[PDB]
Amino acid sequence: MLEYPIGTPQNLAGMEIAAVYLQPIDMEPEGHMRKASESDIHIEADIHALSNNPNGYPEGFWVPFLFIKYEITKVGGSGAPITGDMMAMVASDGPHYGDNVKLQGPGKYKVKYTIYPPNAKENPMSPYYGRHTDRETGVRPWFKTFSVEWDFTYAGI
């Protein structure tokens, strides 16, 4: 697959957090994504387990059932961020968190993701994902909600 990286990946709580973008996409179920024709990019959060992940994920595994909120701000622009929620989905290169986004033209942008664990109150998937807690097969508690930021230059794609 072809993609454009946003800065350098960041490591927290036994996970690698990377930001990427590509052209707007089409998704099933329809009507969840902003129409490809009314967007500039498809923004994505690539979250994979590092070695010795404390929540039982083997290295390189996709970290599922997370909830991601983003804020995108143009440097030198209005000052008001472009906000939204990402959705979990699968593409030809595998599962990820993404959203179709309309930007404010070419320039430098600041990107911030707020990453919610499976048990967060804000996470709508919390009733559907468990975690073993017994000695034999149990794992460490979930990480706390955190935020991650990068800068990037958008030219149009």
Added chain:
Amino acid sequence: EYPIGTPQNLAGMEIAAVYLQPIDMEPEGHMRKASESDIHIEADIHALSNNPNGYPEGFWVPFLFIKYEITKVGGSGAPITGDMMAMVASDGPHYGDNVKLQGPGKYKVKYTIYPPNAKENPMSPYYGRHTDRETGVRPWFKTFSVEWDFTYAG
């Protein structure tokens, strides 16, 4: 960890049925208490090579919904039924449930596997699939069932 027959390959996925001792899970109150159960039943679903839904080989297939039916051979004939739940343990993510059985003997285990877009799947509103030429994948598989036989000895 005890295997239930041999894994089966369908729709670019490997499906294995296993069991182990009953477990404890967060959030509490979803699993049947370990003290009131005999086994923790599990469905191990991983992508094969050339999986049609975009999963690289060996990846856990997420957002599925699994229903099981366990019947004792020679017993009442009425199956033990339930729903599995997606969860993570020390060996990774899987679908599982704490189950009370009907003593030692031979059992028939059937799993019904629902794709992310199935009406029966409560996670359907939360998982998408790219459909465009560049990044898209093939449609989801249709709901299917897999069966095995196994001897339980505690």
